[PDB]
Design a protein around this ligand. Sequence first.
Ligand SMILES: Nc1ncnc2c1ncn2[C@@H]1O[C@H](COP(=O)(O)OP(=O)(O)OP(=O)(O)O)[C@@H](O)[C@H]1O
Ligand SMILES: [Mg+2]
Ligand SMILES: [Mg+2]
Length: 415
Amino acid sequence: PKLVTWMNNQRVGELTKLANGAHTFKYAPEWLASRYARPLSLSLPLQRGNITSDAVFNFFDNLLPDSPIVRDRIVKRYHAKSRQPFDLLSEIGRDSVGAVTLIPIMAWEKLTEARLEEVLTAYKADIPLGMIREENDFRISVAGAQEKTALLRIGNDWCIPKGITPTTHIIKLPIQSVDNEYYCLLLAKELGLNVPDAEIIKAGNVRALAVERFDRRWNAERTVLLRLPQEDMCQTFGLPSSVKYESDGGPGIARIMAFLMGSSEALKDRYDFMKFQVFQWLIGATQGHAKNFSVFIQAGGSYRLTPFYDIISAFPVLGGTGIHISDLKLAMGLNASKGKKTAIDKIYPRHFLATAKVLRFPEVQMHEILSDFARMIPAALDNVKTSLPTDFPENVVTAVESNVLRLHGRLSREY
Ligand SMILES: Nc1ncnc2c1ncn2[C@@H]1O[C@H](COP(=O)(O)OP(=O)(O)OP(=O)(O)O)[C@@H](O)[C@H]1O
Ligand SMILES: [Mg+2]
Ligand SMILES: [Mg+2]
């Protein structure tokens, strides 16, 4: 049938699946006439009538977990009509990344430590996104291939939101990734990068990562929780999650930098994006694909980059399973004298400078970024280390700082 699409308390339009299986979307005239109307996606510009392009199917598919296995679980959990996005979202689309609420204001159930552990380990019983069969009003969806869930934090209590109430945190579970990401987010923050705050939460013998959502915002008085429109780069370019990597045809640095020229914060966003490329290289982050970058869609359809997220270093995984440093590749390659430069172990300042030059990113700014990491990295690693718990896995810290300092040496010798 039909899924009515809401942005907070406003009707945006409807998603329908035709008798031919095609996914179509139509904006409500009331939405189109609203003062600050904005599109669901920059790939789905405001217009009247049914939109039938592949961009519709892809946009909504990108709201679901990437893994075909996780999708199998959802189907089995809610006896979904099929595996298509419309049918899976009919079941779990009330709360997803961004502000799209799909249904065919503030209510919740507080969780006890015992119940919290139940949700956080439900995946062991083939439960998708911690949506235990016990509940029936816990419908959430979150993209990405890593096992996770999402919860509502009210004060210092964890809660399962009911109906259309939003979640406030994305909870990532162990597939040592929890400690890895925790460390990387702290290092990012220490270096002045825009990333969300996160904390390691405990529930029995379970250790998960609770990441504060930047697609959610409480009003000043903390009485109402709103969702903020947001989409990832696959969505913004109308592409399927299957091509998130540049090697599979997804957007690279050049395409995203050109797209950011249209940002309401273009110069800042371009600078921050290039800075983050140098950061990913330094920490051996190999999964900076298109779905790991997003933009907020603002009133009137303007857009701006969101904070960076899903930051994992490959360094702690080296050697243990035979992966060598020479095997680490940036998801989005840099310019090389000939072709591209992708090997973290072979990249130097010259590659960032050559890339900036061809992309019209000021050379002075690129030097600034490189020189800033050259003098700040040592102190940043130390400061983070001192901020880590005492039970934090020392091997993670060792693997990351030794490998970061090794690459950092390349910057300090130049700057
Ligand atoms: N703090 C946040 N606030 C808002 N949205 C977020 C936040 N962190 C992640 N997201 C969104 O949720 C998705 C899943 O998170 P994340 O990228 O961290 O997952 P993964 O690490 O599960 O992903 P992958 O599939 O690459 O392994 C992202 O693609 C992004 O759209
Ligand atoms: Mg991701
Ligand atoms: Mg990831």
